[PDB]
Amino acid sequence: EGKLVNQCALEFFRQIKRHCAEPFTEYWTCIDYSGLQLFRRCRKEQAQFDKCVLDKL
Amino acid sequence: VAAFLKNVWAKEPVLVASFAIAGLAVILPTLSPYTKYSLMINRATPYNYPVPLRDDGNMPDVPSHPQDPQGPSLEWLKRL
Amino acid sequence: MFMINVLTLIIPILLAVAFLTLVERKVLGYMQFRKGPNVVGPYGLLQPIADAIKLFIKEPLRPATSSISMFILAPILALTLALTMWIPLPMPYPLINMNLGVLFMLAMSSLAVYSILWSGWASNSKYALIGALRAVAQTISYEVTLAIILLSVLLMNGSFTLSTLIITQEQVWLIFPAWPLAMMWFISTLAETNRAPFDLTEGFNVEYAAGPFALFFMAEYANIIMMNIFTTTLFLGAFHNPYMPELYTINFTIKSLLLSITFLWIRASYPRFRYDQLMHLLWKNFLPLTLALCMWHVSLPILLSSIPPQT
Amino acid sequence: MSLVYMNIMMAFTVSLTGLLMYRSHLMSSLLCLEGMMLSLFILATLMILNSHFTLASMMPIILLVFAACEAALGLSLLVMVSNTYGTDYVQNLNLLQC
Amino acid sequence: SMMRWNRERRRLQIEDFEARIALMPLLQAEKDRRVLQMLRENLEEEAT
Amino acid sequence: MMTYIVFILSIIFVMGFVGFSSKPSPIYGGLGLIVSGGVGCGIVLNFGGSFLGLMVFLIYLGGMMVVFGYTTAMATEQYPEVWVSNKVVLGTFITGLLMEFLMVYYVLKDKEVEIVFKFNGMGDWVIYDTGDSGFFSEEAMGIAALYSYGTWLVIVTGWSLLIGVVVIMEITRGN
Amino acid sequence: MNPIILIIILMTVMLGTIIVMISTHWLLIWIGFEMNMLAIIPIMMKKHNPRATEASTKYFLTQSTASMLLMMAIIINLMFSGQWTVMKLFNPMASMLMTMALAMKLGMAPFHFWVPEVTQGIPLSSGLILLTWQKLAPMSVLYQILPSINLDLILTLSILSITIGGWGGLNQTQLRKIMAYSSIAHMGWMTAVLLYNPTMTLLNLIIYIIMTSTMFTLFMANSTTTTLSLSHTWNKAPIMTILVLITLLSMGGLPPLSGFMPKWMIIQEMTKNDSIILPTLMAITALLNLYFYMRLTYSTALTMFPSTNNMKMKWQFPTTKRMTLLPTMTVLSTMLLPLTPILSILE
Amino acid sequence: MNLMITLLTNFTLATLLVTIAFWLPQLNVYSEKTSPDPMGSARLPFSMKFFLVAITFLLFDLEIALLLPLPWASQTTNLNTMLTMALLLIFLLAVSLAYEWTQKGLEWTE
Amino acid sequence: MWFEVLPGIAVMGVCLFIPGMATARIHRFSNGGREKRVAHYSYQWYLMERDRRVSGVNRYYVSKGLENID
Amino acid sequence: PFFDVQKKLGVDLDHWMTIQSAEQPHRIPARCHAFEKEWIECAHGIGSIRAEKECKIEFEDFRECLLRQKTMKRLNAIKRQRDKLIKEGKYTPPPHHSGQEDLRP
Ligand SMILES: CCCCCCCCCCCCCCCCCC(=O)OC[C@H](COP(=O)([O-])OCC[N+](C)(C)C)OC(=O)CCCCCCCCCCCCCCCCC
Ligand SMILES: CCCCCCCCCCCCCCCCCC(=O)OC[C@H](COP(=O)(O)OCCN)OC(=O)CCCCCCCCCCCCCCCCC
Ligand SMILES: CCCCCCCCCCCCCCCCCC(=O)OC[C@H](COP(=O)(O)OCCN)OC(=O)CCCCCCCCCCCCCCCCC
Ligand SMILES: CCCCCCCCCCCCCCCCCC(=O)OC[C@H](COP(=O)(O)OCCN)OC(=O)CCCCCCCCCCCCCCCCC
Ligand SMILES: CCCCCCCCCCCCCCCCCC(=O)OC[C@H](COP(=O)(O)OCCN)OC(=O)CCCCCCCCCCCCCCCCC
């Protein structure tokens, strides 16, 4: 069952990598900058990632 | 009870301010409507993992996915 | 690379304490209708260097010490606790980012009275010991309201983290919901460092030389600058952009300079309290109001549903 | 048993032996007694943090507070002794032999 | 002002905690495979 | 060397009590107890007990040992000591403290490693970071639970502190 | 002392003993002992003289050492058991430490060296509290931990307490030190029967508290602190003369009085468990207590009488003192032996 | 680790400045001086008031030690009990202060 | 006149500006151009050590993105 | 004298701090939650005399969970044998215990 998790997580990220890898990369770079990794510092990249994910997937 | 209050406000305003602030700190959490929301926010803050339940077959109030209708919702917290 | 960061904290602290003497003498000069030092350097900029080289080659008094070890360990402890109060201070990111930096600073400032007590017992004088006991009683008196005011303010913070205290004040200064705590905190920090009008030591460490007196002197001024910066972070917290930290650094630097000059401007304005009058100020004026506002800032986020986040 | 617990117990017994062989002063007795209290704090804290037993983490603070209040009481007793004789010497406390 | 901003910070704390909750199955599965990897390695080196 | 650090502090902690259980003076006794409190606090802090270590500093050392040094300094009439120029007044202090660290490093000898290496704790003793705890210090929340769970404990503690104030003011009166 | 403050402090003493009696947790046992000591310290300093400060200092040192040893026993129990229930101890090291600490709190020998001093330094009502109320909490903890108490240690402390409380009563003219050595001997008697039948422990405790309270109430009614001052009772209040001495004939352990009720029952529980030598030796030492206390009885009801002339003035004034429960406690300390099977209420 | 390095560097800078402050003017061969204040040979009398304010500090500092986990206790689910016990502790600190008041404990250092 | 105090205030202000600027630049220098990771809690430290293990060069601040999965 | 007021009146004054397996804040487990739970459920209600001799296996598992003396003994044995084999030169350590294997996750 744990491997099932590790079977379904990768297919989560591949489906981001085929369609929307660039808004996701721009979003996790701004997440990655912060020390506490704030969601509240990255709202326009979050809106772009959510928009591109709601469109393409 | 009023001339004594003016006398103690004239002589010792520090102790009058202290007893007034302490009295308001005592009584005002019960006379407030927003006190229950403190309780609700502190009991809806997820410090642990929400351990799921085995589906025996008859549990209408328990959802199957987080994006389901039933389940405890925080629309009141988002809106207020 | 971390030792570089420790040196770039501790060397500018000593330089700022050196030039605080110049800023104090100039600002107390112009407030007393006179000039401050302007002969030694251009506009007085070599007066701290001349004063330091004078005090560090001045003759030791050959002190008749009641102990060697406490006579040496009082300036050592004074300088060590003067420097270690700076390491959790968020500027906007501290040297030592710790989860309990407020409680750490309260503990390391509560340990700062042993330098006074060991300087007092390390002298043979009974009068110097009486003055040291009075100073210790004053300082541990005002540490009570330091702790209670600090607790009452951090009931709006969520935790004892000093970097979280920047996140707390991003919408409003914390002097707006806590100005009585701010003014009693400010007088309490004024009365901690034996700063005027609470300076009854000039109204205990004179057994030392002029060099170790310069050490106690610079530890006292490092405590003054440090408590002004801590009050700035605690009540007048500045805007912080994580991509340009120099905005926060210049902003809290300007506010810390204004608050240190506010100390300099209080000391050129008032007569001293008598000793029982500042014990009256603590135990009979600041402590009931401080306890009532502690009850108020406990029960107020519960009634307003404004309980700050733990993390 | 364990090693660092044996060290904290060794400190407790050393301050006990200092608390059971008086030299001159009552303040030395109170200092050895509070060194015993310190070692009790340290050993209780290491046990409570070791087992991850959460509710007992308030216990050493309790073990501090009462006992520190206890020390305050002891200091006041010493003071009254030092207000009768001028010193805190334990050999001035021998009037109850008869 | 502290009322509105502490309420918003509580909503942000709940958002971070739900990020943690969404990540805990993967971290728990990797933790299980981590400790079983290390105990199998300790068992084999104990056997040799 | 760095692994056994808690154990090293514990050894120093034991030696710290030998600083003042031999009782050279109540003032040096207080000094040795302050140093012992600092190193026992280091032992506490190195298991993740941050709040309890800061209670050692804030309440035990800066709260109570200040009062012990204060009451000691209002007794035990002082007398001068050696006060020759700097070859005595600081040089003997530095040689004595170097001999003290020589005594600290001197006890880690062949009679110690038969106990250290046969009963190796470091490698398997300090287990406070065994798995994940979450977004909270467990020790912080356990101390926080004093108000919700510890109602009777807080009642009897605050009553004992009020009675402590009353008892001190009654016995320190003389009338 | 302010009487409201006196009422608050006495209720705090009672509260500390009750917290030791009702708690299932070791921290609350320790808290109740700390509260009890902290509150009883001003009771000793009711008169503010140097002997009370010396007595309170010795009491503080001994009870603080016992409190720290109790906390070390609790900490070692938390090592070897990981829990906090007030039940049997799960290490004989922690058992030995808690037995030593409770023997220090009771003043059992060889930790008896503070009991005749402190009782000498303090007034008669505070000595009454120290010898009646302060026994109740450590005897309660001994009642609750008896599956872990070492047999040889508690019997050693018991017979050493009975011998030293016996040979302490020879050289004394002070009534308070005689009550203190009688305390030490009776604590040896109570802890003798603890691991065999603790109902007889509670019977001995209740009969001891009744007799000690009768004796201290008589000492407060006559305001006499020494043997020689007790010797003037026959001329002032002649009804006070014999009640002290039939109560003290009870305190020796002597039939048909009710102070023969504990010791006999203790022997009655130790010959069941095949110990014949040990109750024989302990009650021979109780006869040695009879020897010295009967010499005091001869001192008051007989030979050393003579009065002084100022006593003639005391004839024109009755006792306005509160002799609270003194007829009740005098009847309950002598004539209770035909109701000896009442002891089943203490199970 | 970084904290221990920082404490060690602060201690080293402190001991270095003390050592420079003692050994640098002892290069001088200035003068060996003789002939050793408001008292000359008086003993120290004890003062009860200073000890009263020290013990008052210690008891209120213990009450503050109890009050310290309040920013963490605000996050609990049983807020009615938590608020009652927080107000009860600060009220007992205030009752200790009022008893220190009315029995003349805060006098001549008020 | 009153502006004569400004060189000393300026020197003291630069002396207070240097430590904060210094530690911000050192945090960006030692962590890959970014902030230092704050680990006040066990979860933050667990994610941080997971980053240190997934980066492969014993450095938590090397972020592996979608290029490290297939 | 154990006057059990807390069971008579129905109050919880100090039962909550007593054992590790009680209701902890935020459901934090102790290190030995299972072992103490099994010793308590074994020894429940049967008295101390039967509980000493009839639940000794669960009690020794819980004592060994607390002190870890058998586990430290076993690790000292294995580490001593490993040190003796590295000293003799009859054994070589693996790469996954020397630090050259690029850890799992
Ligand atoms: C953080 C940045 C700085 C913060 C601000 C501080 C900067 C300003 C500094 C100015 C210079 C200070 C010089 C030294 C001061 C020392 C002397 C002094 O002032 O002592 C304090 C004085 C002492 O007063 P006193 O000494 O004159 O009193 C005499 C006392 N008797 C009569 C007993 C002898 O004042 C206080 O203690 C007040 C403290 C602040 C109180 C705040 C109360 C807020 C309002 C509460 C509610 C009131 C109404 C009631 C309820 C209504 C509800 C609707
Ligand atoms: C119920 C809420 C919680 C209450 C507890 C928490 C309170 C927080 C503050 C704690 C204060 C602790 C110390 C209080 C001591 C009070 C007694 C006192 O001070 O009496 C003396 C004083 C006369 O002054 P004097 O003796 O001259 O002072 C010396 C310097 N000149 O006498 C006075 O000055 C009179 C002081 C008492 C009367 C004050 C009345 C204030 C009323 C304010 C409005 C109503 C508030 C509601 C609650 C009622 C409070 C009484
Ligand atoms: C007379 C002698 C000489 C006098 C001058 C020198 C001594 C006195 C002045 C210095 C005082 C030293 C204080 C040392 C400890 C300070 C408290 C502390 O460590 O707090 C910081 C932190 C807690 O915060 P937190 O964020 O929870 O921790 C990381 C969790 N992710 O915790 C940590 O980060 C823990 C870090 C590791 C533990 C550090 C242990 C230090 C060494 C032991 C004590 C040394 C001092 C002994 C003598 C003291 C005498 C007063
Ligand atoms: C399973 C059993 C569980 C436990 C059962 C119950 C045990 C009870 C133990 C009682 C111990 C009582 C100790 C004394 C009472 C405490 C308070 C006190 O001392 O009150 C006496 C009081 C003080 O007045 P004061 O003005 O100080 O007098 C000195 C001169 N100025 O006034 C006086 O001095 C007046 C003189 C007379 C005082 C008589 C007090 C007698 C109290 C005890 C009665 C007998 C014991 C209870 C009944 C039997 C149960 C054992
Ligand atoms: C973060 C900010 C910190 C700022 C700290 C510094 C603040 C002050 C800034 C500079 C102020 C002016 C300094 C120069 C003062 C005047 C010196 C001078 O020229 O003195 C002249 C004197 C006589 O020489 P003579 O040739 O005989 O003259 C007759 C004319 N022919 O000849 C001499 O005296 C000989 C030459 C001596 C020159 C000394 C100059 C000052 C040295 C300062 C050292 C520290 C600087 C900062 C270090 C850290 C930053 C890099």
From Swiss-Prot, chain C:
An example GO biological process term is:
mitochondrial electron transport, NADH to ubiquinone
InterPro entries membership: NADH_UbQ_OxRdtase_su1/FPO, NADH_UbQ_OxRdtase_su1_CS
Entry's localization field: Mitochondrion inner membrane
Give, as one word, the top-level EC class.
Answer: translocase
Provide the GO MF annotations for this entry: NADH dehydrogenase (ubiquinone) activity
What parts of the sequence cross the membrane? 2-22, 68-88, 100-120, 147-167, 172-192, 210-230, 246-266, 287-307
Keyword Transport applies:
yes
PROSITE patterns in the record? COMPLEX1_ND1_1, COMPLEX1_ND1_2
This entry's Enzyme Commission designation comes to 7.1.1.2
Membrane topology note: Multi-pass membrane protein
| UniProt keywords, alphabetically | Electron transport, Membrane, Mitochondrion, Mitochondrion inner membrane, NAD, Respiratory chain, Translocase, Transmembrane, Transmembrane helix, Transport, Ubiquinone
What is one term from the GO cellular component aspect held by the record? respiratory chain complex I
| Record's catalysed reaction(s) | a ubiquinone + NADH + 5 H(+)(in) = a ubiquinol + NAD(+) + 4 H(+)(out)
Pfam annotation, one family: NADHdh
Q: What does this protein do?
A: Core subunit of the mitochondrial membrane respiratory chain NADH dehydrogenase (Complex I) that is believed to belong to the minimal assembly required for catalysis. Complex I functions in the transfer of electrons from NADH to the respiratory chain. The immediate electron acceptor for the enzyme is believed to be ubiquinone.
| Record-stated family | Belongs to the complex I subunit 1 family.
Protein name as catalogued = NADH-ubiquinone oxidoreductase chain 1
* Source organism (scientific name): Ovis aries
Instruction: Give the encoding gene's name.
Output: MT-ND1
From Swiss-Prot, chain D:
Give compartment(s).
Mitochondrion inner membrane
The organism's superkingdom is given as Eukaryota
* Gene Ontology MF terms: NADH dehydrogenase (ubiquinone) activity
Classify the protein's membrane topology as the record does.
Multi-pass membrane protein
Q: Name one GO cellular component term.
A: respiratory chain complex I
**Enzyme Commission code:** 7.1.1.2
Q: What InterPro entries is this protein classified in?
A: NADH_UbQ_OxRdtase_chain4L/K (IPR001133), NUOK/Mnh_C1-like (IPR039428)
> Transmembrane residues, as ranges?
1-21, 29-49, 61-81
Q: Output one GO BP term.
A: ATP synthesis coupled electron transport
- What reaction does this enzyme carry out catalytically? a ubiquinone + NADH + 5 H(+)(in) = a ubiquinol + NAD(+) + 4 H(+)(out)
UniProt xrefs under Pfam families: Oxidored_q2 (PF00420)
Keywords, A to Z, come to: Electron transport, Membrane, Mitochondrion, Mitochondrion inner membrane, NAD, Respiratory chain, Translocase, Transmembrane, Transmembrane helix, Transport, Ubiquinone
The free-text function statement in the UniProt record for this protein reads: Core subunit of the mitochondrial membrane respiratory chain NADH dehydrogenase (Complex I) which catalyzes electron transfer from NADH through the respiratory chain, using ubiquinone as an electron acceptor. Part of the enzyme membrane arm which is embedded in the lipid bilayer and involved in proton translocation.
PANTHER family this protein is in? NADH-UBIQUINONE OXIDOREDUCTASE CHAIN 4L, NADH-UBIQUINONE OXIDOREDUCTASE SUBUNIT ND4L
- Its name, as the record gives it, is NADH-ubiquinone oxidoreductase chain 4L
What gene name is listed for this protein?
MT-ND4L
Curated annotation (Swiss-Prot), chain F:
Q: Topology in the membrane?
A: Multi-pass membrane protein
The enzyme's first-digit EC class, named in words, is: translocase
Entry superkingdom:
Eukaryota
Documented EC number(s) = 7.1.1.2
Gene name, per UniProt, is MT-ND6
Q: What is the official name of this protein in its record?
A: NADH-ubiquinone oxidoreductase chain 6
Q: List the keywords (alphabetical).
A: Electron transport, Membrane, Mitochondrion, Mitochondrion inner membrane, NAD, Respiratory chain, Translocase, Transmembrane, Transmembrane helix, Transport, Ubiquinone
One GO CC term on file: respiratory chain complex I
Q: Which GO terms describe its biological process?
A: mitochondrial electron transport, NADH to ubiquinone; mitochondrial respiratory chain complex I assembly
Organism encoding this protein: Ovis aries (Sheep)
UniProt xrefs under Pfam families: Oxidored_q3
Swiss-Prot record, chain G:
Q: Which reaction does it catalyse?
A: a ubiquinone + NADH + 5 H(+)(in) = a ubiquinol + NAD(+) + 4 H(+)(out)
Alphabetical list of Pfam families matching this protein: NADH_dehy_S2_C, Proton_antipo_M
The family database entries (InterPro entries) matched by this protein are listed as: Complex_I_Subunit_2, NADH_DH_su2_C, NADH_UbQ_OxRdtase_chain2, ND/Mrp_TM
Reading the lineage from the top rank, the first entry is Eukaryota
Sorted alphabetically, the keyword list is: Electron transport, Membrane, Mitochondrion, Mitochondrion inner membrane, NAD, Respiratory chain, Translocase, Transmembrane, Transmembrane helix, Transport, Ubiquinone
Q: Which family does it belong to?
A: Belongs to the complex I subunit 2 family.
Q: What is this protein called?
A: NADH-ubiquinone oxidoreductase chain 2
